[PDB]
């Protein structure tokens, strides 16, 4: 809801009714890469030109963008490190910082495990950062979180993935919505007939 | 000239923008050569993405462009020659042999990046259909390039 | 021309050059053979193109009678290298004139295609319907016809 | 049973042979004018919400006018390619005919057929037959022409306001015709076609010689900058005449001396003037 | 009414005469009111123009500056004006508009915003759209105009 109606950025002068402009651009670019991953993120914020003027002013914000889109993951963490510490100086700040970073760290993992299905976590030791055991513990916390749909491995040291098929995805949604409406007409049939 | 520029930056209309640059050079015809020498660089680059690289040679063989020979016409000839041949590393070699002419961005280096990063998967989609499954050092060998960028370029195509 | 009909007429180009190469040298009349082949560059490309036509004849019959075939067997059956057999087949499939697909990490290539559950079940019902019910209808009526002739 | 509405009437649905034998990018150099027709016809069919977002009531009719052979009928063919509407062609002469009151009933047959159908496009070719404003006719059958105007004016701006139908008109010299047509709300778009000018001679030179084995080092640059202006259909004939004159000496190729024979053939028109009245 | 048919029409003459006789014939019918609307006043026949049949003859002049202001307010209602915009000066720019073209200004001003993929407007956009709608002959050579002083 934030990133949807932040998207009309045509309101310029730092007024009372437009409290700031340049920090408004940083607000709508931080929140923007959670609303959508690639249902054409790149048209609204990257092919967008009026947004591209003022992130040409701020080099660190633009570097934070293009590292994620052009898949430079090692410099993405260094950019994301500055963002979380710079976020600390904010007064609408309490919902952000413990939730924002962990959502983006799992956001970068999910698209990186895409395009592979036999990854080795030794390849995370240099293309990604460092810390063989660090990738190991953080994937283990995220797989056990019910997110990050892949399967980490020990001594083979091969991060195998498992993603569902079409039918294995559609069968799960119909059995969730099936039992919902079944329970819904359980209770309704008991309200009627005494 | 600038009417060619904003028409070029649409990345949609590479034939009318050619006419705007061409009128800009005819206006610049030997009355201000430092502003005129850059004008062939735009209109040949407008012809490169127009995918008629032979006419680059036809213009510089023309008697008006014989006035302004030198390095920068030799840059756009061999770049057009490599793009005509569809040899990918030869484009990179021609990029490497002539740096300071055309790896600077006024503002031709943007579109040359787009045409190069097109021409990779132009050649890559031709050489998948023989097999169901291959190892990637063969496909680096059939493309005559390293495998590390091939890994990043292929993975971007899945994404 | 009879040998280049179909069903391999079982052939091999090494055998073909050593029984009809005498036909390309001097004989009784023989003269269009010396006219077509045997020249300096015109016949010599036609030596190559006859080689091209017979190996193309050997690909189509392989797609008829093979589920799979190893890469080393195809090389020794076409009288040419492993790498040439890669590129000659890769040319025919980007031309999509022979409908095949390879796997060159193991060399096992295949000619058959992945059939569908709508298709495999359609083949299951087709053998079921057309030639287990109709032939069972057919055998019964000849079985009645034998009662005509045999008794009395 | 009840039949579907107007299932026959005048039976005019151009679907799939016959349809355009042209595409949108085939026209060279009408950069303003291809966009302007696209606003009135092509765009509100797809992005109808853009007009609803501003509250515009997008325009309804369009008049094209210019000297003959400047891409008018060709542009109307290109709209009929990339449209997804029910397209109906009319020439401005077959609905004036034999019997009394017969003409305006054919006008009724068209606009009912379009209103019954989908969002639809009606292209009435040259309308200066029935367009000239009459002051009074002291003759029979000239008021029959004059009343075909009035039936056209009614079923364009009457009570009913038949939505989603589109009207494309094209004439010769359009100073002649009725000012009741030319008021907006009825004929909102006024588009003039020039002949070419320079920098559009280049574009028509490009688009014709693109699909052509020119392959020389003798360029048409000498013949972009000529005065004594040359209409866009004639540029076709220059390449057509040189195409005849290339094969006439048994060449696959245009050898650029035929090009001047083709140029002087098409341009040689005013020859006497009696050396008199200058 | 023209004469008999050589170049005579002589059939809608019959139809007109019945209109002329089914409303003022032998029986003055009641509770029936007709509304007839056309331009070209001097050429319709002076027997259905007599004041026994049509009693109210109502002109429709081109509107005034206040009236051009009001029609502009009607059609810009659903439109989306920016701020700081003077509608009065726009109607001052139209000496003798119709009112069917006040809509044309409102469509073309919205059309200028459409090609920008924008919803805004300026007063200058109307200053361009008025001169677009207003169109003249631009009488050339001055010899005609000054022969006739
Ligand atoms: N810009 C152009 N690009 C390509 N061909 C053109 C162009 N302009 C004109 N032509 C050629 O001119 C011919 C005439 O086109 P068209 O009939 O649309 O002209 P026109 O103005 O409609 O003529 P008329 O008004 O007499 O019907 C077409 O067949 C087309 O080949
Ligand atoms: Mg025509």
Q: For D43-66, give the DSSP string.
A: HHHH-HHHHHHHT-----EEEEE-
| Residue C152: cis peptide before it, omega within 30 degrees of 0 | yes
How far apart (Å, rounded) are the C-alpha atoms in residues D196 and D235? 10
**Packing angle of the helix pair D258-267, D232-247 (nearest 10 deg):** 140
Technique that determined the structure: cryo-EM
Q: Please state, as a whole number, how many other Cβ atoms lie within 10 Å of the Cβ of residue D259.
A: 22
Indicate the pairing of strand D61-65 with strand C109-110.
unpaired
Beta bridge partners of D90: D124
**D70 is an annotated ligand-binding site residue:** yes
Indicate the pairing of strand D120-125 with strand D86-91.
parallel
The answer to whether E133 and E105 have CB atoms below 8 angstroms apart is yes
Largest CA distance in chain A: 70
**Beta-carbon-side half-sphere exposure of residue A121 (alpha carbons within 13 Å):** 23
Q: Please state, as a whole number, how many other Cβ atoms lie within 10 Å of the Cβ of residue D55.
A: 15
Query: Would you call B109 helix, strand, or coil by DSSP?
Result: helix
**Torsion over CA of B125, B129, B133 and B134, rounded to 10 degrees?**
-60
DSSP-H helix ranges across chain A: 2-5, 22-30, 32-35, 41, 50-54, 59-69, 73-87, 97-113, 132-143, 166-191
Q: Phi/psi at D61 (nearest 5 deg)?
A: -135, 160
Beta bridge partners of D165: D120
Beta bridge partners of C52: none
* Interchain touch A–C (≥3 Cβ pairs closer than 8 Å): no
Q: Are the Cβ atoms of D203 and B15 closer than 8 angstroms?
A: yes
How far apart (Å, rounded) are the C-alpha atoms in residues D18 and D14? 6
Indicate the pairing of strand A159-161 with strand A150-151.
antiparallel
> Quick one: how far is CA E119 from the chain centroid?
30
**Beta-carbon-side half-sphere exposure of residue E63 (alpha carbons within 13 Å):** 17
Residue E116 CB burial class (10 angstroms; 0-12, 13-18, ≥19): exposed
Q: A88 alpha carbon to ligand 2 midpoint, in Å?
A: 70
The answer to whether E106 and E72 have CB atoms below 8 angstroms apart is yes
Rg value, chain A, Cα: 21
Identify which of A78, A76, A54 has the alpha carbon closest to the alpha carbon of residue A65.
Answer: A76
How far apart (Å, rounded) are the C-alpha atoms in residues E99 and D86? 32
The answer to whether A25 and A55 have CB atoms below 8 angstroms apart is yes
Residues 6+ apart with CB under 8 A from E10: D140, E2, E4
Q: Which atom of ligand 1 is nearest to the CA of D200?
A: 1
Q: Which of D206, D217, D219 sits opposite B15 (nearest CB)?
A: D206
Residues surrounding ion ligand 2 at CB below 5 Å: D 73
Task: Give the ligand at the shortest distance from the Cα of D171.
Answer: 1
Q: Which of B129, B134, B138 sits opposite C93 (nearest CB)?
A: B129
Is A167 at the interface with chain B, CB within 8 A?
no
Q: Is the torsion defined by CA of B87, B93, B98, B100 positive or negative?
A: positive
How far apart (Å, rounded) are the C-alpha atoms in residues E9 and A88? 92
Rg value, chain C, Cα: 24
Beta bridge partners of C110: C68, C101
Query: Would you call D169 helix, strand, or coil by DSSP?
Result: strand
| Residue B107: cis peptide before it, omega within 30 degrees of 0 | yes
Query: Would you call E145 helix, strand, or coil by DSSP?
Result: helix
Task: Give every strand in the sheet of A118-119, ordered side by side.
Answer: A118-119, A159-161, A150-151
Q: D166 alpha carbon to ligand 1 midpoint, in Å?
A: 22
Residues 6+ apart with CB under 8 A from D75: D27, D30, D33, D34, D37, D64
Give this entry's resolution in angstroms. Answer: 3.3
Per the structure block, which two tokens stand in for D75?
A: 């542009």
Residue D4 DSSP class: P
Is D199 at the interface with chain B, CB within 8 A?
yes
* Interchain touch D–B (≥3 Cβ pairs closer than 8 Å): yes
Helices and strands (H and E) in chain E: how many: 6, 0
Buried b (16+ CB within 10 A) or exposed e, C74-103: bbeebbeeeeebbebbbebbeeeeeebbbe
Min Cα distance C109 → chain B (Å) is 9
Q: Please state, as a whole number, how many other Cβ atoms lie within 10 Å of the Cβ of residue E88.
A: 11
Residue D94 CB burial class (10 angstroms; 0-12, 13-18, ≥19): exposed
Min Cα distance B30 → chain D (Å) is 18
How far apart (Å, rounded) are the C-alpha atoms in residues B1 and B23? 8
Q: D236 alpha carbon to ligand 1 midpoint, in Å?
A: 9
Beta bridge partners of C109: C69
Query: Would you call D269 helix, strand, or coil by DSSP?
Result: coil
Q: Where are the beta strands (DSSP E) in C1-152?
A: 68-69, 102-103, 109-110
Q: What angle do CA A134, A135, A137 make, to 5 degrees?
A: 65
How far apart (Å, rounded) are the C-alpha atoms in residues E88 and E67? 10
Per the structure block, which two tokens stand in for D146?
A: 């004059």
The answer to whether A33 and A41 have CB atoms below 8 angstroms apart is yes
Beta bridge partners of D124: D90, D169
């Amino acid at each position: 809801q934030a990133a949807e109606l932040f998207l009309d950025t045509v309101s310029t002068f730092t007024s009372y009714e437009l409290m700031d402009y340049k920090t408004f651009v940083t607000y709508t670019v931080y929140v923007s890469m959670i609303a959508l991953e690639r249902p054409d993120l790149r048209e609204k914020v990257i092919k967008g030109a009026e947004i591209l003027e003022v992130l040409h002013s701020l080099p660190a914000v633009r570097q934070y963008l293009f590292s994620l889109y052009e898949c430079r993951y090692s410099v993405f963490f260094q950019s994301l490190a500055v963002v979380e510490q710079e976020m600390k100086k904010d007064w609408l700040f309490a919902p952000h910082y413990r939730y924002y970073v962990r959502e983006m760290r799992i956001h970068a993992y999910s698209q990186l495990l895409e395009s592979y299905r036999s990854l080795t976590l030794g390849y995370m030791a240099e293309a990604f950062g460092v810390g063989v055991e660090f990738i190991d513990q953080e994937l283990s916390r995220f797989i056990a979180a019910g997110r990050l749909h892949c399967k980490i491995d020990k001594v083979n040291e091969i991060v195998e993935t498992n993603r569902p098929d079409s039918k294995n995805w559609q069968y799960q949604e119909t059995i969730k919505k099936g039992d919902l409406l079944l329970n819904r007409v359980q209770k309704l049939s008991r309200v009627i007939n005494m | 000239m600038q009417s060619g520029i904003i028409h070029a930056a649409e990345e949609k209309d590479w034939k009318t923008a050619y006419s705007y640059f061409y009128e800009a050079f005819e206006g610049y015809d030997s009355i201000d050569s430092p502003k005129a020498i850059t004008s062939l660089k735009y209109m040949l680059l407008c012809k490169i993405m127009l995918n008629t690289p032979e006419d680059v040679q036809a213009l510089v063989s023309g008697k008006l462009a014989l006035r302004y020979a030198g390095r920068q016409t030799e840059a756009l000839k061999c770049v057009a020659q490599a793009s005509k041949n569809r040899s990918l590393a030869d484009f990179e070699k021609a990029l490497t042999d002539y740096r300071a002419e055309l790896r600077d961005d006024p503002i031709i280096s943007t579109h040359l990046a787009k045409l190069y990063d097109n021409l990779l998967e132009q050649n890559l989609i031709r050489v998948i259909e023989p097999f169901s499954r291959v190892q990637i050092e063969h496909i680096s060998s059939l493309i005559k390039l390293s495998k590390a960028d091939v890994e990043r370029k292929l993975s971007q195509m899945i994404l | 021309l009879l040998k280049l009909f179909t069903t391999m007429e079982l052939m091999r180009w090494s055998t073909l050059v050593e029984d009809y190469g005498m036909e390309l040298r001097k004989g009784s009349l023989e003269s269009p053979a010396t006219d077509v082949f045997g020249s300096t560059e015109e016949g010599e490309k036609r030596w190559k193109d006859l080689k091209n036509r017979v190996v193309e004849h050997n690909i189509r019959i392989m797609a008829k009678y093979y589920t799979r075939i190893t890469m080393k067997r195809m090389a020794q059956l076409l009288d040419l290298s492993v790498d040439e057999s890669e590129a000659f087949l890769s040319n025919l499939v980007v031309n999509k004139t022979i409908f095949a697909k390879v796997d060159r990490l193991a060399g096992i290539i295949n000619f058959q295609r992945p059939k569908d559950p709508n298709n495999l079940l359609n083949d299951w019902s087709q053998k079921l319907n057309s030639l287990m019910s109709l032939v069972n209808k057919t055998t019964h009526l000849i079985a009645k016809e034998e009662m005509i002739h045999n008794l009395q | 049973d009840v039949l579907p509405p107007e299932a026959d009437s005048s039976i005019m649905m151009l679907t799939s042979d016959q349809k355009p034998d042209v595409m949108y990018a085939d026209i060279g150099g009408m950069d303003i004018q291809k966009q302007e027709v696209r606003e009135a016809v092509e765009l509100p069919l797809t992005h109808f919400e853009l007009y609803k977002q501003i509250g515009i009531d997008p325009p309804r009719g369009v008049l094209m006018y210019g000297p003959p052979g400047c891409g008018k009928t060709m542009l109307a063919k290109a709209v009929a390619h990339h449209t997804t509407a029910a397209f109906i062609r009319v020439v401005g002469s077959e609905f004036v005919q034999k019997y009394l009151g017969e003409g305006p009933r054919m006008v009724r047959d068209v606009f009912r057929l379009a209103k019954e159908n989908a969002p639809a496009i009606i292209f009435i070719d040259e309308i200066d037959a029935i367009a000239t404003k009459r002051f009074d006719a002291q003759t029979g059958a000239d008021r029959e022409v004059q009343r075909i105007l009035l039936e056209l004016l009614n079923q364009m701006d009457g009570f009913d306001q038949n939505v989603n139908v589109k009207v494309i008109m094209a004439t010769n010299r359009a100073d002649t015709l009725d000012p009741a047509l030319l008021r907006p709300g009825r004929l909102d778009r006024k588009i003039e076609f020039p002949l070419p000018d320079r920098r559009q001679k280049r574009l028509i030179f490009s688009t014709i010689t693109s699909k052509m084995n020119l392959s020389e080092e003798v360029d048409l640059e000498d013949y972009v900058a000529r005065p004594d202006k040359i209409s866009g259909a004639d540029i076709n004939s220059i390449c057509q005449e040189s195409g005849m004159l290339a094969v006439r000496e048994n060449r696959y190729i245009v050898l650029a001396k035929d090009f001047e024979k083709a140029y002087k053939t098409v341009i040689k028109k005013d020859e006497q003037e009696h050396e008199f009245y200058k | 009414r023209l004469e008999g048919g050589s170049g005579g029409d002589s059939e809608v003459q019959r139809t007109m005469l019945e209109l002329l006789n089914q409303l003022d014939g032998f029986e003055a019918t009641k509770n029936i009111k007709v509304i007839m609307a056309t331009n070209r006043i001097d050429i319709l026949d002076s027997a259905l123009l007599r004041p026994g049949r049509i009693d109210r003859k109502i002109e429709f002049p081109p509107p005034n500056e206040e009236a051009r202001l009001d029609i502009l307010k009607i059609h810009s209602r659903k439109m989306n004006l920016t701020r700081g915009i003077n509608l009065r000066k726009i109607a001052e720019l139209m000496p003798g508009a119709s009112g069917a073209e006040v809509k044309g200004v409102c469509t073309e001003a919205g059309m200028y915003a459409l090609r920008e993929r924008r919803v805004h407007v300026t007063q200058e956009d109307f200053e361009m759209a008025v001169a677009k709608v207003m169109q003249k002959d631009s009488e050339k050579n001055m010899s005609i105009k000054k022969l006739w002083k």
